[PDB]
Design a protein around this ligand. Sequence first.
Ligand SMILES: *C(=O)CCCCCCCCCCCCC
Ligand SMILES: *C(=O)CCCCCCCCCCCCC
Lengths: 32, 32, 268, 62, 62, 235, 235, 60, 5, 5
Amino acid sequence: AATSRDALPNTEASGPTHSKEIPALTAVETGA
Amino acid sequence: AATSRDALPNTEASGPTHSKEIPALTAVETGA
Amino acid sequence: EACGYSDRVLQLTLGNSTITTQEAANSVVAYGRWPEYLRDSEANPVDQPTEPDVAACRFYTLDTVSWTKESRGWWWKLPDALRDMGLFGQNMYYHYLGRSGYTVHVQCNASKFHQGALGVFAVPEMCLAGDSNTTTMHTSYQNANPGEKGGTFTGTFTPDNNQTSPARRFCPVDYLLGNGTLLGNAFVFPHQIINLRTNNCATLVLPYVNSLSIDSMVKHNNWGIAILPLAPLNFASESSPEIPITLTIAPMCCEFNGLRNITLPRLQ
Amino acid sequence: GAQVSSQKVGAHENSSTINYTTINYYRDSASNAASKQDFSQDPSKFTEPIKDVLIKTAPMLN
Amino acid sequence: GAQVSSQKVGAHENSSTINYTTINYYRDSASNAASKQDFSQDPSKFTEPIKDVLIKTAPMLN
Amino acid sequence: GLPVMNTPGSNQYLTADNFQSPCALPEFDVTPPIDIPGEVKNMMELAEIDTMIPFDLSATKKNTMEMYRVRLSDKPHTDDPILCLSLSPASDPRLSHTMLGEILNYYTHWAGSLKFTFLFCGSMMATGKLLVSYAPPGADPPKKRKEAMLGTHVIWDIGLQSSCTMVVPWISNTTYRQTIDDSFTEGGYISVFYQTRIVVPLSTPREMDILGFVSACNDFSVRLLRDTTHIEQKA
Amino acid sequence: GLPVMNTPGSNQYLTADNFQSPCALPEFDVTPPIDIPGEVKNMMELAEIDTMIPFDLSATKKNTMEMYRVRLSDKPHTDDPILCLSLSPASDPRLSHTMLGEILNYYTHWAGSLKFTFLFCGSMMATGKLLVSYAPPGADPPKKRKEAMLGTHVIWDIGLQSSCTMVVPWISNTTYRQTIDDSFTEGGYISVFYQTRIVVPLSTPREMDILGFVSACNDFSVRLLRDTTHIEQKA
Amino acid sequence: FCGSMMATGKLLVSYAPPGADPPKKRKEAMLGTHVIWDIGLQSSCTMVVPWISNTTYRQT
Amino acid sequence: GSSST
Amino acid sequence: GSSST
Ligand SMILES: *C(=O)CCCCCCCCCCCCC
Ligand SMILES: *C(=O)CCCCCCCCCCCCC
């Protein structure tokens, strides 16, 4: 149902972080 | 009912002003 | 977590800055208190505070030092180390009063064939001893405040004998934590150990600590960071090994009172 | 005839109102100690002795 | 205004809680004796100041 | 009789003590009070009354009526100070003898907000805008309007309301400041400047005086009673 | 007035007494507390914090950073001790100056269980098994692994968990031990041994340090407050 | 990072929005948007350059 | 008896 | 009167 002329996603407000979640780290070897 | 050892008044938060109220201006001639 | 999460792998994000680590040994929150802003019930200056938020509460990286077999130790004072750091420093010098907490992240990586252990200590009110046996409490403000550069510990107390032009500086002997108390007990202070076989880093979250709710950041340092080699650096068989130690610090929940013209200190 | 009153407690021990007890031993009030249970008043009779009540946001003279 | 409290009784006579009585004579708390009725706290803020709660049977590092 | 045991402090005389003692004139018929006007309940009531500042304690004006007058004139705009004052209410020579300063010298510690009111005593035909400033401590004391501008300030326009009040807000690190000159508890700087200039027409005096007053705001308190240095008795 | 009778003890000054006394500054406006981080309620909280032991107080290593480092090496298995220590927490030179030892020197009597934690500061490539022992008092102090084996012990395998803790259980005849060297209240012997040996590969340092820490278990208490010999003032 | 498993290191990846001196030293780069990448089992690190522009669209 | 306050 | 504890 996503039309070509639909608006792209909104930027959500984000605060400080001190976590075990690591989005910045990855492994491109996987192919992704 | 104000006791000597009662605490003095709290400072209330105050914002910007653009008004016809003039607290800063006065006339000491009055005696006050 | 069965879905991969670990105490060794962390991501910290403050403002426009992110730190990653894959070899951490958890992190310490000093005295169990996370940094907070000054509450109305504990407030004292009545003027509206300046709170710079992301412009100052972000990660500043100070100059990298070098760990060798000769290294006796290093020290820094807060807020002093950060006095020239971007908009934090500017806000610090334009206001009479300021308070701040900090995230301290000490960085030191090496290899599975290196050895050594750094003790990283956060000391509230780290008053250090001076170089004189003839006069006391006489270290100059300039010498007491090295800024980003920090200072070092010595293995030997060597008294300033120049009575006519006194050096007026600290002489911090390492096993006495530069203050007359024994280093083995410094572990009652908030700390972590970078033991090279275990971790690349130390992370300490520091609350604002003082006997006042807010104070002069220019006249007074609240915290001292002391880094000392508990176990000396060693590698394979090389007589003179070296590995870098990088220090990155973020102000947290900082607010400032008493705005006026900028303070221009005599730092030399 | 004992009089029991609250202490305004400043520095607290690591240890609820604390009280103290007073008994007057003499017939003459002059012999009595100072209660220190005193009142405060508004400074107006000195700071604002003007016949027409002032409003601080308004012009003092009009 | 008398305060009555329990004594922790150590060596007992060949003789049920034993009490002692306290009355404050002065208006200022500073004049008061030391209660000694103090509290104890958990050493955690010093012994375990780590962000992620430790389980002693589990590997400290994982 | 009742078994008693003497504690330390026994038989001493503390001049600040508060005990009962025998009356030397029993059953004396005391004269009742009447309702005298002007009763005071607390010394701080007096500190809240505006009192005039001896601003000009220059060698020839001090201890004369002249010390109270700050002279202004219709001269061209300058950025130099009309007056400069350290916020040391009990110890600065210009504040220490005001009613506020005098009560403060009977106590060791003060806290709270202060207010300075200036009265223009020039002719009605005279106009002008002035800048009244307060700089909290820690930087170079303001010697030019450009630095004073950056702190707490009021721009006073002279007109029918003759007087203007600047409030010096309680901005301190410590909970209480000392009643002596001490850098650890220093309060900052008050300075006055010409924003534009005083303008008079012809046939008008080109020089005039302003008078200044200080008093305490309702959040002001003092503590630790002490003896003053402002009175003495040699022999 | 009321018939009273003075008992012994009257007018004495016991420095450990607990009495009311007149306040010299009545009605003083006290500054309220703020919530300062790090409050302590009992000295034993501090004794429960791990502190580093100066194990090697040899003539050239004492009073230097070196006294804290116990050197190990990849040498062949021996049954001889790495270190030997008397369980005298307040009086043995290696324990007496630790935070635990220091608090213990302000008291006459101690009781409870202790724990010793060792940290291996060698490379990740280094492996090894060590035996940490505690022998209760009364026999020959262990000088060989064979005797140490027979008492309370932990066999520590070096690996990702860098550190190992041996608990010294409260095993005493008396309810409390003294804070001085005294045979009647002697606590026994701590000794460390190589179970197998430290093994390194090539290109790896063959010598490394271990560090040791001591702290008190939650069943630990001290009593009879006294003055310490660890500070003094000649003149 | 395509180095051996035995190799360790920490790098700083930076993004400075336009208008000042282009960063030639870590001290200036530190002050802008950045990631401190620690090399380890997760081989790769991603820095996001956030849309920070005055105009709604930039030119190609 | 006890006048409280 | 008597505050017990
Ligand atoms: C009211 O006071 C009733 C209770 C009295 C309690 C005992 C008082 C202590 C002795 C006071 C003696 C009288 C003083 C001349
Ligand atoms: C509460 O205290 C009510 C009962 C009082 C019992 C008698 C107290 C003994 C005398 C105390 C005198 C007051 C001290 C200034």
